[PDB]
A = this chain, B = another copy of it.
Amino acid sequence: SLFELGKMILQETGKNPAKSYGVYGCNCGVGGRGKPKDATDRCCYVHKCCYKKLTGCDPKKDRYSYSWKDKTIVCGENNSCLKELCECDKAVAICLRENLDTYNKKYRYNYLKPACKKADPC
């Protein structure tokens, strides 16, 4: 769920995830996908596509379990949808950390998300 996602991001990046990503770029947080603004945004794009291929569980609502093992996110549990959901979220959190070096405060409150360029199909 949103709660696990927000936690992973906080863990990998050290940043308040809602403040740093809740309205970041064209893909991060509220809203849909759009053409990525930068590497950070592209992480979020890839993440929302990752959600699209899931069946059998609800990405936003359904909790799943994961652990923080040697400062590594490790997804927990069998149920094929929830595992894949966890892997989606993990990959985003790592991706956001890998790309903090180009994080742009400028894109942080992108209230113009409805105006992002449409995204390619996943």
Contacts and interface: CB of A to CB of B under 8 A. Distances in A.
Interface stretch (A41-49, A63-71, A79-87): A63-71
A89 interface: no
A47 B60 CA distance: 42
A6 to B, nearest CB: 15
For chain A, give the interface size range: under 10
Contacts of A69: 14
Nearest to A72: B71
A34 to B, nearest CB: 28
Given A11-B71, A12-B71, A70-B97, 6 more contacts: A11-B14, A14-B67, A14-B68, A14-B69, A71-B71, A71-B97
